[PDB]
């Protein structure tokens, strides 16, 4: 009973790194990863995994954090490490935008360059 | 079932609409035939009328009991877990 | 970190807990010292006065915390067993305390080669005959294996003795017997 | 490799743990200790170095504490031209009893999709030969096609007519694959293959592959076994640069399957018992089956309407993943036209005057006009009859069921169920008969002449014998 | 007699003892046992109480295994211990069941004495894949005229009869397996089907009912029954099907024909649902599981019509599915609907208004078709059918009503094929439009009875070879033409 | 909603139905004869 | 062995043993109770605990409370001393007429009949009742079942069967009370005393009388029918009589076991009902049966919730009858009594060689007339009367006088209603029905054949209208 | 003395769990600290399924819960006659306390 309340957690604490800034995934499983730790991540904060995916804190829980997944699953396996880059999801705007094909978070799927606006918006 | 209700209420409004219209037009051309012709259509029109009332009381009962019964299945999976 | 799981396998907050320490304690070999020291914590919070104060869920998870604290230094008990019921106590499950402790103690049981053996007799069964009973048991086990025998006697069997060497079993009751030439009988 | 252990098989789902190397999602497992071959695929890592894994076949047997191994990779299939003429399941073995597949090279059955400047935005009409595909609305050259069809309209009739007709019109390495469909049906394709020389036997000269994993088959083989069809295709289209055709039987059984797993793989139930992930699996699925400027890859997919609705989840999920929709309507079957294409409910990306010409586009937007104000004036029709009508509207309504017979036509493969022969009609043959049959240049001939006829010539052919006759 | 207990009632009896692996029972209630230990089980494999009660291990889990439980629970306690058989579950195949009356796992019921059985066979075999089957080419001959000339069957055809209560399911059937007698105790050995009857959930005096009709037909002869009725354990009535199934598979891979009837499949996935759900398994729609589609699709795709090479035996199966109020949407239908070759539909309407068998030809296809039909019957059929959807569409409309009153048959009279062909043929070719449509039975029933009495050439004719030839044709011509004018 | 009295099958369905084929057998007669 | 309760959650009780765990099915007593409290054992939850189901109200059950084990299941008295008497669902008399003193005791759990003990026979059981005779006729030893939404008409037509029935019946009879109103209980007994069947004051009754009323909590209303049960059961095997088994309610059987299975912890099935519907009712429903040692003529009044015949409790009892009598709320409103359903009501002894060919064939061409006015109905409903042919306003015409002529009057109806009943033998039935297809009344009208008897009556009443 | 006194352990959707009230009957009334009266409905191993007459904003984790020792009655008698009294046989038309001399479950 309890997400936290793996055996390797609790043996690590029974034995006696930062659980502040940086998690670790307890399962992962259909976009949805448990990370133990990040006691100081902030909901719908944008977090990064140590494949280069990033995630989103949507569940802040008392001993887990639900984060979804920006990508696919197979590249995140149990004990990856999660880190914290500190702000709420945000995209680039301006008028370097128009005539661009952009994903959901403003990178170009067009091939035509890195968009080169100067302004970001949450 | 929703779809066979569905399927029956369309069908009597169409009949509904196209006995109104008959009657209307009995209504014109009557300007003794034709005056039973206008009665009855009229007649026709007013039944279908009580069979839609009827059929639309039907459809939102069942209507209602199928949102009912999905939420419950979705409910009892959630709680098996 | 790789865990290191203990031979016999246990379930439950109970069984990850005694997982848990098992793995810990095989870490730094200390397996036999924190088990008295676990029997120890259970014949000391089975005593009314702990148990009626860590059991009350109204008095603060933090001062319950500090007072195991101090009752784990004050009796001489190693870091392990220490930060063993700190963590217990700080996801309050101190209520499994006495579970914990029963799984690791047969974990440890199993680890010392203990089998658990059953000997259903209809009587109260002959001594020098429980004796050969004994020597012919210990035949079915491999090495460093020892019988931890307790005979109950059922009156029901008619007869013969009923074995269960941990999971292995015999049937050698009479009862069984004539059942058997019933069914046979009748089919 | 890493080594693990079976902790709990409930069903068709195996959780394995793993005390050393933990092994990522999607990987091929293989159960140790079995005289066949068990393969698990990881789903889920569940904590605690468990794995939860859906099994590829049957699970009966299975022991707790029975050993599992690493494969270090996907589900990995044998690809390149020696799959021409053979039979492989989901994992890639043979199943035609005719030996190991060798081959120089396998790949993942689990990939990415192309990506967005990968997408080629050309569109050329394939013809087909049916009158009702063809004009209403047609396919194209390296679409996604997909056939939506209650049970027993008759979609895999009309899918081994288009394998007939295109595929032996293709030079290019067809592709068919079999999920959770019937095992007769799939031997009769096979030997219909055999027969009419597509698949060669012996000479190895054959043209299509084939992958099967049937109704018989547990949740995972046919959840996975579009995804081995797809990866042959795949390959013949990216590492070939082939034209590729891919016929699949049914698609609605991945999504099956899937829903089949869903509870037990520890996820709440969504809307009419499907799972959570039913559009998102649905994708990365369909986005894989697609033309990109490497090559083509014409895409034929039999969609199973569950009673009939077509707002059930998974078809209605499954029509914006293509580009030409034809939707097989029962109320046209019982009519005993054949094939039962629904002419108001097929929908073609190509149907544009700017692409087809404008003597197809408007034949085709009159006839769908025609039809639709027959729909209207069946009402008038139901209360007062077909005498009290209006010339003009009888008219309408006689030229409408002539539309309606011509719109069927003979299958060559449905001789056994026809008994009429099989017709081919090329496509200026049917837009200039429909275009006549708007105008009303055979308003003296009888309905009846334009049932189950080929061409025009026939229809006429046919009135005149049915005079001579009658 | 005291000499039947003792000759080796007593002194054979195995009375060796074994070392065996056990479990123990954590907790029993509904059927299901949760057991400790048991550590080397395997998945569906067949355990054993100490009550001689046995068992099914479908839930193998960490601390426990789920066990299913083949009768009462009643006797099981906690802390019983639950012995291994070390076999998946399986059952006696072979001639022996024939004539007999067993239980969902073979024990003879009809106290009759033990089944003589050398062979057994696992229940959940897997299907002949791609290369073992061929086409469907022998028909399966039901007796029943609109089946045999409309919705026709072959062997290895799977053809679902559906419809609501007490529409006629259980008596198309038995009229199908009563049939088979002409060609059973015939000489041709690849035209002897022998018959298989699964009674799902249903009442016992219902199945004494139809062993009655299939013993005055003299038809248990060749008939295996198989009965998990509504007293039942819901294991044993979720695992009759599959044990008909390998009762019918030793047939099938032994070059004969054999025929299997489950009546009905919805009892066996209500059964199935109740399984799952006291083993904790999550509910799908309407609580069913999520793989009762599985449950019928892996037991329905065992049904084949084999190859030269395999023996060229045959499985037809004849699901039974009970709808409510006519709805064919619902789950379980939809599922049995996808997976077989075709479809007999009853109604209720139909059954009213005096069509008796009920049959809705609009809607009842055979997708084997014309294929596994005599060529006799394939000729007169075409017309029929051709005739009877024309009426259908303008309900000539008397020649119609002809044909549908000629589709009318009584209950346990099924026809040979060469007088369903007379009959198809005299009503088909306008020699009962000169009747009215009321005396249409008693003149079918007349022109039978002196056709069988007086021209058992003719008939001997069709029969042999298959067809009705030119020659046959004018002769069955005069002979019609004759008995119409004499009545 | 058009064409819903034909689609849902009832007894105005059936004599549609009856209606549109003995109407337009009577002309298929009537349209062979002088073909 | 004695065990000490640790949880009560409604009905359910929890019980754990320190030493010897009862079977399950056991009967436990609590003690220190007032009146007996009986547990019956469910489940063997583990760790010696087991989970029980209450016969009586659970209120001023405390945590600890010793309760003491049996031995066996609940055990209740069967014999001949029961008839004339009232007993509750563990077998104690409810009547006030102290012990009933019989010889034996029975488990009202028990074994279904085997295969090899089923009858086959198929004889008639003639009613009385037109609807029921002509077209879905009783057998006798066989299993009837009248269903019905609420105000139908149940306990009306099955009164009427014990009236026409029971007294006319040579053997003995059970009313099984499970779940309905106790004024109807007080009703029945009162009525049997007055009309002799009940005799208090010697040993020639011939009734036996179970209640457990909706009243009840939900453990007597599941058990009470299987105590009913043991009673006709002792009746049939121990003395091979024939015996006569009223069940008035049984869906509550259904409804009581769903109540219990909120609380026992089980995942629920479709409409909330227990997952172990089908399976509960087939054990109960196996034992109300003929067997080769004696007959049960079985009848039931099965509670169709709302009016869905769809609904799991019926559908599921659908199929353990060899005769169902459908009580029909539409017809009802039609003032044509008794409700039943002509077009939903089946026998499986209609059958031509079990009845004979007039039989069979009045009755369907009773039935396709029925159905050819059914399919009439909406071109009736919409388009009026007049634009049908002369054949459909023929069949109109008659189908309506068979409607009308299917409607028949009480005994026990009289007393709101003012007409007398009418008993109709089955010829006069079979040939009023034949004489109105055949067209010898289509100059009467209609409503001279609501309400009668014999066609005579019709007759009669056609003159006095005139 | 958790024997005839309890501690509100969760307070929400109308049901308050209590820990103690050992001897507490089921179907029994108690009383919270608050002046809030309930009913012990599901007697557990652990605790104490409470239906709360009134509103559980009055409840509070933690709160002490006495048991009356009474299964759940009202007042009864002709005292009541003229009077308007809530589910509990308060009087809420101000016209001062029921006389009432009997109580009944
Ligand atoms: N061809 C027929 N002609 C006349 N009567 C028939 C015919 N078929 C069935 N019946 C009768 O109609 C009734 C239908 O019962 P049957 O068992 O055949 O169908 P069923 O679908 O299995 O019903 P259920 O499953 O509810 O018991 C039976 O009484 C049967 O005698
Ligand atoms: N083009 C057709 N011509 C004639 N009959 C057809 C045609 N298509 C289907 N049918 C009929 O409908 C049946 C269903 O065929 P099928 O292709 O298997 O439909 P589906 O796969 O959608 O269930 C066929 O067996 C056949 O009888
Ligand atoms: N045979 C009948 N004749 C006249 N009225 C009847 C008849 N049966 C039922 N009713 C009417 O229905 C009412 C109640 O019927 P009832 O026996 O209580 O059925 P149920 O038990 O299903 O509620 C009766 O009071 C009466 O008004
Ligand atoms: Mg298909
Ligand atoms: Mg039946
Ligand atoms: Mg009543």
Do not use: W
Request: proline share 4%; glycine share 10%.
């Amino acid at each position: 009973t309890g997400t936290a309340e793996m055996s390797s957690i609790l043996e690590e604490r029974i034995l006696g790194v930062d659980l502040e800034e940086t998690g670790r995934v307890l399962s992962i499983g259909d976009g949805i990863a448990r990370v133990h730790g990040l006691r100081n991540v902030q909901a719908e904060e944008m977090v990064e995994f140590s494949s280069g995916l990033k995630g989103m804190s949507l569940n802040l829980e008392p001993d887990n954090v639900g984060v979804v997944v920006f990508g696919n699953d197979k590249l995140i396996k149990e004990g990856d490490i999660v880190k914290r880059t500190g702000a709420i999801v945000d995209v680039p705007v301006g008028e370097e935008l128009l005539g661009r094909v952009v994903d959901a978070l403003g990178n170009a799927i067009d091939g035509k360059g890195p968009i080169g606006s100067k302004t970001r918006r949450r | 079932t929703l779809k066979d209700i569905t399927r029956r209420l369309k069908s009597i409004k169409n009949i509904q609409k196209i006995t109104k219209s008959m009657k209307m037009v009995a209504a014109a051309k009557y300007a003794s035939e034709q005056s039973a012709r206008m009665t009855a259509m009229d007649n026709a029109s007013k039944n279908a009328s009580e069979m839609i009332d009827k059929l639309t009381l039907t459809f939102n009962r069942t209507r209602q009991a199928v949102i009912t019964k999905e939420l419950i299945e979705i409910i009892s999976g959630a709680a098996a877990l | 970190a790789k865990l290191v799981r203990p031979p016999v396998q246990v379930y439950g907050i109970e069984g990850r807990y005694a997982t848990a320490l098992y793995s810990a304690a095989s870490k730094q070999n200390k397996l036999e010292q924190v088990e008295k020291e676990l029997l120890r914590v259970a014949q000391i919070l089975k005593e009314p006065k702990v148990a009626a104060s860590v059991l009350n869920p109204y008095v603060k998870r933090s001062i319950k915390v500090k007072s195991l604290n101090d009752i784990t230094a004050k009796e001489r008990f190693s870091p392990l067993t220490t930060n063993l019921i700190n963590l217990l106590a700080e996801n309050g499950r101190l209520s499994n305390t006495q579970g914990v402790v029963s799984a690791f103690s047969t974990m440890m049981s199993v680890h010392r080669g203990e089998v658990p053996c059953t000997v259903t007799s209809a009587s109260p069964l002959e001594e020098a005959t429980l004796s050969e009973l004994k020597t012919v048991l210990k035949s079915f086990l491999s090495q460093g294996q020892v019988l931890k025998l307790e005979a109950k006697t059922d009156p029901s069997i008619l007869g013969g003795m009923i074995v269960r060497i941990g999971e292995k079993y015999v049937d050698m009751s009479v009862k069984t017997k004539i059942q058997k030439l019933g069914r046979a009988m009748r089919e | 490799a890493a080594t693990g252990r079976i902790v709990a098989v409930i069903g068709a789902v195996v959780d394995v743990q793993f005390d050393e190397g933990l092994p990522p999602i999607l990987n091929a497992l293989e159960v140790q200790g079995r005289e066949t071959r068990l393969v698990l695929e990881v789903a889920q890592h569940l904590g605690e170095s468990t794995v939860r894994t859906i099994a590829m076949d049957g699970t009966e047997g299975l022991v707790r504490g029975q050993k599992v191994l690493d494969s270090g990779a996907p589900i990995k299939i044998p690809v390149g031209p020696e799959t021409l003429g053979r039979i492989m399941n989901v994992i890639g073995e043979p199943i035609d009893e005719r030996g190991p597949i060798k081959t120089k090279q396998f790949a993942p059955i689990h990939a990415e999709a192309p990506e967005f400047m990968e997408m080629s935005v050309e569109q050329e009409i394939l013809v087909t030969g049916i009158k009702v595909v063809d004009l209403l609305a047609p396919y194209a050259k390296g679409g996604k096609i997909g056939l939506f069809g209650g049970a027993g309209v008759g979609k895999t009739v009309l899918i081994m007519e288009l394998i007939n007709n295109v595929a032996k019109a293709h030079g290019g390495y067809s592709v068919f694959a079999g999920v959770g469909e019937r095992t007769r049906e799939g031997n009769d394709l096979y030997h219909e293959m055999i027969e009419s020389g597509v698949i060669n036997l012996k000479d190895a000269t054959s043209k299509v592959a084939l992958v099967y994993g049937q109704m018989n088959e547990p949740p995972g083989a046919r959840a996975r076994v579009a995804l081995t069809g797809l990866t042959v295709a795949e390959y013949f289209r990216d590492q070939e640069g082939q034209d590729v055709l891919l016929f699949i039987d049914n698609i609605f059984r991945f999504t099956q399957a899937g829903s089949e797993v869903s509870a037990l793989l520890g996820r709440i139930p969504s809307a009419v018992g499907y799972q959570p992930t039913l559009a998102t699996d649905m994708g990365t699925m369909q986005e894989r089956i697609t033309t990109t400027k490497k090559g083509s890859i014409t895409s034929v997919q039999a969609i199973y309407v569950p009673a009939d609705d077509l707002t059930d989840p998974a078809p209605a999920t499954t029509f914006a993943h293509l580009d030409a929709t034809t939707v097989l309507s029962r109320a046209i079957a019982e009519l005993g036209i054949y094939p039962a294409v629904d002419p108001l409910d097929s929908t073609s990306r190509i149907m544009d005057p700017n692409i087809v010409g404008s003597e197809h586009y408007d034949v085709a937007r009159g006839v769908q006009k025609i039809l639709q104000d027959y729909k209207s004036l069946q009402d008038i029709i139901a209360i007062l009859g077909m005498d009290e009508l209006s010339e003009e509207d009888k008219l309408t309504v006689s030229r409408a069921r002539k539309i309606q017979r011509f719109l069927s036509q003979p299958f060559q493969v449905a001789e056994v169920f026809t008994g009429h022969m099989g017709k081919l009609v090329p496509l200026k043959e049917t837009i200039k008969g429909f275009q006549q049959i708007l105008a009303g240049e055979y308003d003296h001939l009888p309905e009846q002449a334009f049932y189950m006829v080929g061409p025009i010539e026939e229809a006429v052919a046919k009135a005149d014998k049915l005079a001579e006759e009658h | 007699e005291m000499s039947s207990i003792l000759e080796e009632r007593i002194l054979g009896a195995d009375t060796s003892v074994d070392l065996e692996e056990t479990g123990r029972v954590l907790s029993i209630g509904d059927g299901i046992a949760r057991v400790h230990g048991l550590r080397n089980v395997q998945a569906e494999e067949m355990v054993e109480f100490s009550s001689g009660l046995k068992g099914m291990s479908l839930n193998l889990e960490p601390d426990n295994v789920g066990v299913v439980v083949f009768g009462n629970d009643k006797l099981i306690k906690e802390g019983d211990i639950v012995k291994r058989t070390g076999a998946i579950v399986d059952v006696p195949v072979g001639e022996e069941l024939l004539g007999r009356v067993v239980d969902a796992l073979g024990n003879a019921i009809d106290g009759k004495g033990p089944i003589g059985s050398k062979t057994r066979r696992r229940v959940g075999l897997k299907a002949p894949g791609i290369i073992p089957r061929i086409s469907v080419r022998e028909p399966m001959q039901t007796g029943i005229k609109a089946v045999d000339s409309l919705v026709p069957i072959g062997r290895g055809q799977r053809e679902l009869i559906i419809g609501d209560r007490q529409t006629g399911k259980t008596s198309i059937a038995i009229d199908t397996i009563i049939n088979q007698k002409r060609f059973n105790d015939g000489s041709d050995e690849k035209k002897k089907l022998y018959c298989i009857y699964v009674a799902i959930g249903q009442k016992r005096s219902t199945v004494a009912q139809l062993v009655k009709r299939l013993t005055d037909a003299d038809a248990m002869k060749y008939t295996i029954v198989v009965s998990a009725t509504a007293s039942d354990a819901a294991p044993l009535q979720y695992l009759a099907p599959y044990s008909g199934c390998s009762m019918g598979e030793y047939f099938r891979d032994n070059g004969k024909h054999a025929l299997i009837i489950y009546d009905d499949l919805s009892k066996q996935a209500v059964a199935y649902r109740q399984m799952s759900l006291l083993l904790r398994r999550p509910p799908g729609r309407e609580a069913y599981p999520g793989d009762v589609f599985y449950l019928h699709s892996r037991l329905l795709e065992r049904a084949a019509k084999m190859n030269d090479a395999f023996g060229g035996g045959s499985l037809t199966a004849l699901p039974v599915i009970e709808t409510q109020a006519g709805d064919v949407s619902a789950y379980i239908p939809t599922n049995v609907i996808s997976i077989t070759d075709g479809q007999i539909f009853l109604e209720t309407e139909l059954f009213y208004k005096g069509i008796r068998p009920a049959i809705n030809v609009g809607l009842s296809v055979s997708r084997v078709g014309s294929a596994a039909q005599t060529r006799a019957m394939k000729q007169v059929a075409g017309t029929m059918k051709l005739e009877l959807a024309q009426y259908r569409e303008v309900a000539l409309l008397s020649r119609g009503v002809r044909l549908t009153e000629l589709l009318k048959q009584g209950q346990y009279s099924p026809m040979a094929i060469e007088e369903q062909v007379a009959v198809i043929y005299a009503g088909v070719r306008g020699y009962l439009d000169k009747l009215e449509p009321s005396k249409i039975t008693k003149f079918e029933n007349a022109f039978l009875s002196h056709v069988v009495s007086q021209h058992q050439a003719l008939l001997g004719t069709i029969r042999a070879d298959g067809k009705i030839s030119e020659q046959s044709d004018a002769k069955l011509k005069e002979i019609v033409t004759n008995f119409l004018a004499g009545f | 909603g058009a064409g819903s009295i034909r689609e849902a099958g009832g007894a105005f369905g059936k004599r549609e139905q009856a209606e549109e084929e003995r109407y337009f057998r009577a002309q298929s007669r009537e349209q062979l004869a002088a073909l």
